[PDB]
Structures are given as structure tokens and as C-alpha cells.
Amino acid sequence: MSLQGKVALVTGASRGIGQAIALELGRLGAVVIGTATSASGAEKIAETLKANGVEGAGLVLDVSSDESVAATLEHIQQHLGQPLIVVNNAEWFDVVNTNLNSLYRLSKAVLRGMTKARWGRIINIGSVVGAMGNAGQTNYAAAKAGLEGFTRALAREVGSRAITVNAVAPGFIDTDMTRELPEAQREALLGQIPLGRLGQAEEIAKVVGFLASDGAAYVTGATVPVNGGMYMS
Amino acid sequence: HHHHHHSSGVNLYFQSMSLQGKVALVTGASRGIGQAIALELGRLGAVVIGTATSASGAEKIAETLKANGVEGAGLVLDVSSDESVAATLEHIQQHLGQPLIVVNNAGITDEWFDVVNTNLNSLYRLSKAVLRGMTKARWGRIINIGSVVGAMGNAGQTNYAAAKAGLEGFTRALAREVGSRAITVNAVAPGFIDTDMTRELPEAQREALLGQIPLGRLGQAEEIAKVVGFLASDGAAYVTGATVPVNGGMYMS
Amino acid sequence: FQSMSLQGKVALVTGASRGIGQAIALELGRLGAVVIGTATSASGAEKIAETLKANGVEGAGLVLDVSSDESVAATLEHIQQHLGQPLIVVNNAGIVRMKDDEWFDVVNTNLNSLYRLSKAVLRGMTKARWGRIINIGSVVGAMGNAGQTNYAAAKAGLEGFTRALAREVGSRAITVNAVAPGFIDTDMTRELPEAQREALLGQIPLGRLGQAEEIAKVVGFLASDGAAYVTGATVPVNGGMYMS
Amino acid sequence: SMSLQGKVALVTGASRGIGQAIALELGRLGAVVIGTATSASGAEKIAETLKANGVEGAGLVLDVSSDESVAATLEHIQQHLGQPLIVVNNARMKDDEWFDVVNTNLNSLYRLSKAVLRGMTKARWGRIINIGSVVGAMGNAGQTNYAAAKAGLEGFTRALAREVGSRAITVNAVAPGFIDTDMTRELPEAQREALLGQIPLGRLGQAEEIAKVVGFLASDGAAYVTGATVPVNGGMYMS
Ligand SMILES: c1ccc(-c2nc(N3CCOCC3)c3sccc3n2)cc1
Ligand SMILES: c1ccc(-c2nc(N3CCOCC3)c3sccc3n2)cc1
């Protein structure tokens, strides 16, 4: 269950789910690189890791940019080591297209190192439900369908190398779309969730921590729903 | 006499032990996956009741628990029988306490309808029986173990897929039903797992099998058991209605 | 030899006295089948026979209880003796406000009955080396969570049952498919307050309830020779309203 | 009842196999059919096929990868035949090329779909029917590609249906299994045999069996079917 001796990269680590993931992997003993798109977000990450006794760094990374990805990886490899645990946490058509093209960019870049080690964990984090109505449902379901299929396919491609590829599909998690809702809306929402509560960011992080472990070595191509029983597609 | 209840026998605090003596019931614990689950829940600090259909199986479980330092028992239980389920649960409650982790791994094997029907009816019988105690505790974990791929050809594929589809829908529906009580209900769907059957395959046939699996190897029973352990934990509290495939990337439907 | 035509075929449609089942019986009739529609009561069987007559469809209304081995055997014997072997079988005979604990008994009963009838009519199809089995799913039965739990469980059960049976019987050129309705224009829909009807229509992309005839047209197509390579499929007929 | 009289249909990749069969089936039902190919010679062959089957319409050159080709083709059709309100999108493998294949194909579906949606939105009626890939390519890479494309098509179809449904436009997909085409007909015998053994019906499907499903989906009887992917695979499900 422990990750001592491993380097983990967590994209979008400055708040909410990404931050929780960074802290959890740190708690399990990994060296953690968390990333944000701004210098201010990188500084927040570095302060957070320091405050929690986690070794690593806060770096600026734009996953939409081949240049930013190549430059950031080379920097990590020179100063911390090769990341063997990569957690991807950084209208419906353009959103899905952009997001899967980013996942593909980052995954390809980190796979060289994983192939050298003959070991790896790629864990892709889905989007939380972003909005209540029909457009929200369309977007949530399309993004999740894309993520599920992308994950299954990359897992096939890299499996002979003892690299697993999985996803975590969060439902309604306690974050700002939810934290800003009128009470009538929050109540209606909670009524669709069998557990009758929103998820905590730490509850997504614990699942990620398990997927990253040696105990999950035979889990690949999977999408683990973390949604308190609320299934939408 | 045949004796049907066998105890383990029972100041080192292992870091892994987080389930703080919660009682776990693992059906079909005498070998393979079920045995691995029973051991993993013991490593995690549960009191483990493992079951088999015979007194000899129940004794073998108790010896396994003993040899591994796990507190608990090997008991006879037939999940196909209302009488056996009722009587056995009452016995557990009187002697060891209310099972709040229940792992359904017992299950029987043109066959497809009667197999799936029998199996889902058993899952429902046992699950409904343990729910009072979980409801009273306002906490529970029900974990359902799917069937491994049992045979290579078309009848095998039909069975495997029909069982898996039944288990996935069942799990989701029972999760919906019992969620307001902070009971989770999840499934684990194994792929090809290294057992006595698969070790004895001719090399040409093992090779063809491994070719269908991205990881290029059979799964270990312990690799199923670790997933079960996680799902039993407080960290999986928001995971419910889920079926977790543990198959090395080999997805058959 | 014509696309879509069911001339020369005998179709059994269970639960044919109203709504979706009646629409199916009339659609298969329009396509040229001899149609045996069934109900659980003599009254329902008479209504079917009158409906068929009124529409110029040859066939009969019979009393059938799919829960009973004796009823199933008797009904098949009657049909074989007087009309011939049914080679198209359409299953539409599913069994305090609805709660989320009802899904198990309902699904268990409905799949058991479906298996019973399907196994019985397979002998005749196996002999003919041709068949169509078409299973109709249950519409959404209530608004809210219990409604969704129950609808989803039934649909999941029917999808898996359909796919498995198709696999079992495919080598005999018998196809087995399902049609999974969404919200169809029926009484639970009528009883809703207008604000509730509006909210319901807002979960459906097409913005309307489906008609029984829209289910029936899918069934007619599946029954046809043109659908001979479609097997093990569940066709959703739900106006874009997907819930599982 | 099944009639498409008065409707214009555009069928991409109509010069052979499944696309050709679709063109002919929509024509049998009474549609005016515009079938496309990537070359002038393919477009002329389409036109001769239509004539030989008594179907009104035309062959045209279309490159679904090109915004310019798509815009120019639609402007041509609108000027000479009318607005297509039925559109059928029909136009070794490597272990790490599945992403670029799916990405390209979906980007092309989206490009053509968005272009024909204007006319359908104006009419408040339409049918978009997307045809998936045929099973057959060799090895694990073939399986990876097939499965990824299928998952992409299913989700794409469901999402676009949600987006356009309020306009009485339906959007559905057909997912073929192992179909008798020019591309499967001469696969190595061991591969054909292995695939046949995975198919309950025990035979390859015919292109016409795909076309009949498309014909049904284009009909008014399918007006409540949207966002669906209909598998047409003889019971052989590959995921
Ligand atoms: C082949 C054969 C049988 C089944 C099946 N599925 C069920 N369910 C419960 C609802 O969720 C889906 C599965 C249930 S519930 C009681 C019986 C039952 N049977 C499925 C495939
Ligand atoms: C493997 C590889 C790629 C995909 C995939 N899925 C997509 N979808 C899925 C359907 O939801 C719309 C977006 C989309 S949309 C733009 C690109 C794209 N790619 C799926 C499996």
C-alpha cells in the first residue's frame, strides 16, 4: 500500500480534488510534483506540500501545450527523477476533444520513463457533475464516455509493460458548483444520491491512492465510479 | 461427530490493521479467491468468519485462519437455503457479533439462466439477512464477487457475460435500495485468475489465453483480495453500486 | 417475397389487450401476420379478438398466464392445432406508492416467465430453423428515485437476458432482441400535475412522450427478414432519455 | 409507411459495400439520393449505380476532412436538389494509432453533422445516421482500434442526439459486426474462421442487412429512436 521511493506527478493540484490527491500520495510516501497553470498556483502547491511534510515540488504546466509538457518533464527528470505515477486532473465536443487530446499528450510523454522502469500507473480523473440541467447531463455523460473509452484503449496499448491505466469518475463532490447552490437545489440534488450526501475530495483521493498501489496491479482499463450511487450517462 | 463451527484459536499491532475487530463474513472461503479475501480482511484487522458447505471445509478454513494469526472461525453455510442462512447468522450474532462486512463469494456453476438466477437469488437472500444488523450500526459493506472466466469457448463466453451483466445490475440496484443507511454495495469482477485449473493448461492453450490479456499474465487471488479490502475500508465510503473489473485489461462481454 | 412482409407467419403477442401490446398486435397484423394476442383474463382475450376483427387482422385472442407451465403448454397446443407454429413471439406480459425495494421480485418474476415462454416456443422455431423473439421492456413506472431504480433494474435484466438467449439460439437462425421504451403516453403520465409533466418532458431531448405505435413500428422492423443479422440487441425507444 | 418520398438523402462513401447498399435502400424507399466518393471517377460510378437501380439523385465528390469541401458540396446540393434532411455518415493497424484514428473520424463526423444541421434546424426535422467500422483487422491492435472507435461513436451519437432533439432531429448509429465486403472477403482464412466462430448466427452479415436497419431508422416509424447505437453483428459482441 506504500509509495516510498516513487515519484508522482499530479496535474491541477492547487485546489479541491487535485490537492487532495497530491496530499494522499504524499501521505503514502511518494515524492509529489503537483502542477498548476500559473506561478501563483504552483506556489500554493509548494506551500501546501511543505505544510504537510511532503517532498516534491509545485510546477507550472499547461497540458494543452507540447512545449510546456516537454519542458516540464525534462525539468522533473533532471531535478527529482522519473514520474512513475501520473495523475491527470487538469460545446460538449470541443471540451471532450480538448481534454482527450491533453490526456494523450501527457500520457505519451510520461510513458517513456515508465517503459524504462517496466512499471507505471496512469490515473485519469473525470469531471464532476458541473451543472444540473440537460446541458450538464450531456456534457458530464460525454466526458465520462470519452474518458472510459480512452482509458480502456491506452490500457490495452501499454499493458505488456506492466503499466496500468485507470480512471476515477467522481459524481457530486463538495466543491464550488455545489457549495454555491440554493438550498432547494442542494436538497433536490442530494435526493438523487443513494448515500444522501456529497462526496469529499479526500474520498476521491483514497481511491487514487489504492489504484497507485501494488495491490491494484491487476486493475487496468477500469473506470471506478465515486458517486455515492448516483449513476448518470 | 461432524462439527460445523471451528474457531481459529485467535501484542503486535500491525500498521495494516484498520478494521478494528469489525466482524467480516466471507462465503466460500476454503480455497482460491475466497481464502485470499478472508486472509486480506484478517491482515486488515477484521474478525473473520469464513464459510464452506461442509464440515471438512469449515475445519480447513479455521486451520488457515489459525496458521495466519487471524481471529475468527470456519462455519458451514449454504447460501441456497433460507434455513441455513437464518440459523447460521443467528449463530454468528450470538457467538462473534454482527457481521458488518459481507463478502459474497459462494456460487454455483443452456446453463446460463439457471446459474445466474440461482446465484442472484442467493446474493439477495444473504444480503437481505445481514442488512438489519448493518442498518442498526448505520454502517456496512456488501461486496459481491463475480465469476472468473470459467471456460474458453462460446458457452463459457455466454455464461461469463450473462453472470457479469446480472451482477452489475443487481449491485447497482441493491446499492440504490440500501444507501440511505450508509451501507455500500459493490462488486468485483475477476478476469482470468491463476488457480489449479489454469496451471494445468497445455502451454499452447495458456499462450493463446495470455494473448487476450494486455498485462500478459493471469491474476493472482491476492490481487482480487486487495481490491475487496479496499472496498471494505473507510476510504471507499463514497464508492457504491460499482463493479470493479480486475482482469488485466481483458474485457469480455 | 417482399420487404417488411410477415405473410405466412404466425405471431404470438403476450399482453395484447391495451397500450403497447395492442399496438404491436395491430402492427404485425398490418404487415400480414396471423396474430394471436393474449391476456390473463377472458375479458381481455375477447377485447383482443374484437380489436383484431375490427382491423381486418386474422388471428385470435387467448388467455395465457406466462407464470404457469400448464398455461404456456396449453396455449401453444391450441395455437399449433388451429393456426400453426408461432415463429414470431413478442413478450409484453410483465406482472402504497412504488418503493425502491420492489425491483428484485419484479425482475425475478418477469425473467422467469420470459424464460418459460421462450423455451416453450423455441422447439417450433428450432424445427423451422427460423424465428423472431422480441422482448418488450417496462416503461418508466413512477417519477423519482424508486421509479428510476426499478426501471433501471428491469432494463438491465432484460438487456442481459436478451443477449444471452440470442447467443444460445443463434445457430438456428432465431434472433432474440429487446425494445426498451422510455416514457410512453400512459396513465402515470396523465395523473401528473402540469409542473410535473413539464419537468418530465424536460428530461426528454425530443420534448414529448412516446406513442405506443412508435414502439410497435420498431417491433415490426425486428420481426422482418431485413433484421435477420440484428440479434442480442436492445433497441432503446426513449426520445433520447437515457437512465440506468 | 416506410416511405421516404419527398426527402433528399446524403450518403457519404456510397461507391461500394455498405455505403452503396445504403444508397440503394434509401432509394428503394423513395428518397432522392446524393452519394459521395473521394474521386470524380467514384462519383460517376455512383451516378451510374443509381441509374441502374431506378434511383433519382447524383454522385458527388466530398472530402469529409475538409471544411471547404463540406461547405461547397452542401451549397451545390441545396442549389440543384434541395436540403438533405437524411444524412448517413459512412465514409496493419498500429497498437498506438487508435487515438489519431478515432480523433480524425469523430472530428469528421462533427464537421459534416454541424454543416447539415442548419437545414434540418430550419425544417424542424432530420435524420443523422452514423455507420461504425466493420470487424476484421488483424491482431490486438485491430481489437483496440475497433473497440475505441465503437465507444467513441456510441458516446458521440448519444451526445449529439441530446443536443439536437428539441428540433425533432434524430441522431443514431449502426455498429456493424463481421460483414461481407470487399475488405473482408479476402482476409486470411484462419482469421475469417476465428471470427465466424465468435458469431452465434454462424455467418457473415450482408451489406444489405446493414442498409435495412438504416432505412428503418430514416423512417417516420423510428421517430422516437434517438441517441441509439444499433448493433448489427449476428450476436458477436466485441468490447
Ligand atoms: C441473465 C439472466 C438473469 C438475469 C437476472 N438479472 C437480474 N437483475 C436484477 C436487476 O439488475 C440486472 C440483473 C435479476 S434480479 C432477479 C433475477 C435476475 N436475473 C440477468 C441476465
Ligand atoms: C477512445 C478514444 C477516443 C474517444 C473519443 N471519444 C469522444 N467522445 C466519446 C463520445 O462522447 C463524445 C466524445 C470524443 S469527442 C472528440 C474526440 C473523442 N474521442 C473514445 C474512445
Short mmCIF file of C-alpha atoms and ligand atoms in Angstrom, two decimals, chain B residues 112-121 124 158-159 161-174, chain C residues 103-112 115 149-150 152-165, ligand 1:
data_model
loop_
_atom_site.label_atom_id
_atom_site.label_comp_id
_atom_site.label_asym_id
_atom_site.label_seq_id
_atom_site.Cartn_x
_atom_site.Cartn_y
_atom_site.Cartn_z
CA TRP B 112 -26.77 -19.73 -18.14
CA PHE B 113 -30.29 -18.82 -16.95
CA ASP B 114 -30.50 -21.29 -14.02
CA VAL B 115 -26.95 -20.40 -12.89
CA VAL B 116 -27.48 -16.65 -12.90
CA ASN B 117 -30.97 -16.94 -11.40
CA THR B 118 -29.77 -19.22 -8.58
CA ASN B 119 -26.77 -17.03 -7.89
CA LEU B 120 -28.67 -13.72 -7.77
CA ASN B 121 -31.33 -15.24 -5.60
CA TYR B 124 -30.30 -11.40 -2.38
CA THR B 158 -22.28 -16.56 -22.83
CA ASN B 159 -22.22 -17.61 -19.19
CA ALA B 161 -21.15 -12.29 -19.86
CA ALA B 162 -24.66 -13.11 -18.52
CA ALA B 163 -23.34 -13.51 -14.99
CA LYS B 164 -21.41 -10.31 -15.18
CA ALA B 165 -24.39 -8.37 -16.55
CA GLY B 166 -26.63 -9.77 -13.81
CA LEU B 167 -24.10 -8.94 -11.09
CA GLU B 168 -23.53 -5.41 -12.30
CA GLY B 169 -27.21 -4.56 -12.46
CA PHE B 170 -28.04 -6.32 -9.23
CA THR B 171 -25.24 -4.48 -7.38
CA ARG B 172 -26.31 -1.10 -8.67
CA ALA B 173 -29.97 -1.76 -7.73
CA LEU B 174 -29.20 -3.04 -4.19
CA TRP C 103 -37.09 -4.39 -8.18
CA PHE C 104 -35.89 -7.82 -7.20
CA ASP C 105 -39.23 -9.64 -7.10
CA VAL C 106 -40.43 -7.91 -10.25
CA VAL C 107 -37.34 -8.67 -12.27
CA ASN C 108 -37.11 -12.24 -10.92
CA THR C 109 -40.74 -12.96 -11.81
CA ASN C 110 -40.60 -11.30 -15.22
CA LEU C 111 -37.37 -13.02 -16.33
CA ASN C 112 -38.54 -16.40 -15.06
CA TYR C 115 -37.56 -17.85 -19.90
CA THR C 149 -34.24 2.17 -9.50
CA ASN C 150 -36.99 -0.16 -10.68
CA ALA C 152 -33.11 0.60 -14.48
CA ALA C 153 -33.03 -2.80 -12.83
CA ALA C 154 -35.66 -4.14 -15.20
CA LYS C 155 -33.92 -2.76 -18.24
CA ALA C 156 -30.54 -4.17 -17.17
CA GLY C 157 -32.04 -7.57 -16.56
CA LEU C 158 -33.82 -7.62 -19.89
CA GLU C 159 -30.66 -6.48 -21.80
CA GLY C 160 -28.55 -9.26 -20.34
CA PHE C 161 -31.21 -11.93 -20.63
CA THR C 162 -31.77 -10.97 -24.28
CA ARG C 163 -28.10 -11.05 -25.18
CA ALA C 164 -27.58 -14.44 -23.53
CA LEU C 165 -30.58 -16.08 -25.10
C1 LIG E 1 -29.37 -13.23 -17.45
C2 LIG E 1 -30.16 -13.99 -16.59
C3 LIG E 1 -30.75 -13.44 -15.46
C4 LIG E 1 -30.54 -12.10 -15.14
C5 LIG E 1 -31.12 -11.55 -13.98
N1 LIG E 1 -30.88 -10.31 -13.70
C6 LIG E 1 -31.41 -9.72 -12.63
N2 LIG E 1 -31.03 -8.47 -12.43
C7 LIG E 1 -31.52 -7.68 -11.32
C8 LIG E 1 -31.63 -6.32 -11.86
O1 LIG E 1 -30.37 -5.78 -12.34
C9 LIG E 1 -29.98 -6.57 -13.51
C10 LIG E 1 -29.94 -8.04 -13.26
C11 LIG E 1 -32.16 -10.34 -11.76
S1 LIG E 1 -32.94 -9.83 -10.32
C12 LIG E 1 -33.63 -11.39 -10.11
C13 LIG E 1 -33.24 -12.17 -11.08
C14 LIG E 1 -32.45 -11.63 -12.02
N3 LIG E 1 -31.91 -12.22 -13.10
C15 LIG E 1 -29.71 -11.37 -15.98
C16 LIG E 1 -29.09 -11.92 -17.12
#
